């Protein structure tokens, strides 16, 4: 869809999950948006 | 295919299908579709 669905410096609406605690099951879906356990345990909605 | 209401792979869209014809010679094979493939069995076999 790049021919019709792209912007010069846009297309921020296209999102994908970059990190997760564990892999999803076959044909499984996850819509949660909790902070990833980046090295440390997942922080509860804060920086750290 | 044409709904395009899945702009983000995160929170992807799902559908269930039953009670129809499934003529794959047209589906996934018209000009708009750039790529198409089947795993484990050829489309020619799936056609029937």
């Amino acid at each position: 869809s790049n021919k019709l669905d792209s912007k010069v410096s846009g297309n921020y609406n296209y999102l994908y999950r970059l990190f997760r605690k564990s892999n999803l099951k076959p044909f499984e879906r996850d819509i949660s948006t909790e902070i990833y356990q980046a090295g440390n345990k997942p922080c509860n909605g804060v920086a750290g | 295919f044409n709904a395009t209401r899945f702009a983000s792979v995160y929170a992807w869209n799902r559908k269930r299908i039953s009670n129809c014809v499934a003529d794959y010679s047209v589906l996934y094979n018209l000009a708009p579709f750039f790529t198409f493939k089947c795993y484990g069995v050829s489309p020619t076999k799936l056609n029937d």
Epitope: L4, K7, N13, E34, I35 | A7, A11
Partner: antibody
Framework: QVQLVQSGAEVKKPGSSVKVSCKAS????????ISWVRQAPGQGLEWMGR????????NYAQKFQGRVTITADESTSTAYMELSSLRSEDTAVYYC????????????????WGQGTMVTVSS | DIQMTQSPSSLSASVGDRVTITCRAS??????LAWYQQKPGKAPKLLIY???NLETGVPSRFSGSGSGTDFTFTISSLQPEDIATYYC?????????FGGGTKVEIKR
């Protein structure tokens, strides 16, 4: 339920800088997003910026880039906007909005506002 | 940047009459265009976000369609409580552009 609470009336001299707030409540704060909008007495709408407090990413309109900044903190459960170079034309009703449209197939449109803060710039 | 217009700028009809409006944009698209119902100084209510699509909670009283640079928006019926201004919005690209407005009111 999800709700937004805004501050009271605020006024400042031209050319100054002002701080405004939008208190979010209900459900889980980390799952919400906040946006800011301005509404005059009949002029068209203006959109200032957008933030995702859980992740801290923000973006802006070209008209307000540089002169305006947004910060939001979960611990205080409110979102903040920073304004500078205020002028008389800013006299309007200032609204904060929640963009829940990012995780269920609903995309990039608000469905919840606060009470709205009227603002005025005059000598 | 993306610019759009609405025509006609005002509608007047009696209670229970059919209403329709159209919105034009600068670039031809087939999705990512929204519609709003707005009143002076009051919050807009979302009815359409993408071409001919709506959420849960949107009443069946509103509808829209179109292709290319012109999309239509239709209202099944009108009542006095509906005195407001319909608006079209577009978000194919980040510089969101908002419509010129169409007033709707009651004939008498």
């Amino acid at each position: 339920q999800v709700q937004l609470v805004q501050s009271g009336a605020e006024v400042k001299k031209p050319g100054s800088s002002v701080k405004v707030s939008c208190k979010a409540s209900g459900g889980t704060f980390s799952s919400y997003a906040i946006s800011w909008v301005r509404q005059a007495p009949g002029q068209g709408l203006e959109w200032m910026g957008r933030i995702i407090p859980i992740f801290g990413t923000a973006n802006y309109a070209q008209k307000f880039q540089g002169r305006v900044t947004i910060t939001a903190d979960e611990s205080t459960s409110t979102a903040y906007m920073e304004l500078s170079s205020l002028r008389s034309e800013d006299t309007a009703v200032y609204y904060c909005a929640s963009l829940a449209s990012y995780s269920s197939g609903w995309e990039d449109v608000f469905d919840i506002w606060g009470q709205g803060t009227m603002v005025t710039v005059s000598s | 940047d993306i610019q759009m217009t609405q025509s006609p700028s005002s509608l007047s009809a009696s209670v229970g009459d059919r209403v329709t409006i159209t919105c034009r944009a600068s670039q031809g698209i087939s999705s990512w265009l929204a519609w709003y119902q707005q009143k002076p100084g009051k919050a807009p209510k979302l009815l359409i976000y993408d071409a001919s699509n709506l959420e849960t909670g949107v009443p069946s009283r509103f509808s829209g369609s179109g292709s290319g640079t012109d999309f239509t928006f239709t209202i099944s019926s009108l009542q006095p409580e509906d005195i407001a201004t319909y608006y079209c919005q577009q978000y194919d690209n980040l510089p969101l552009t908002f419509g010129g407005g169409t007033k709707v009111e009651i004939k008498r």
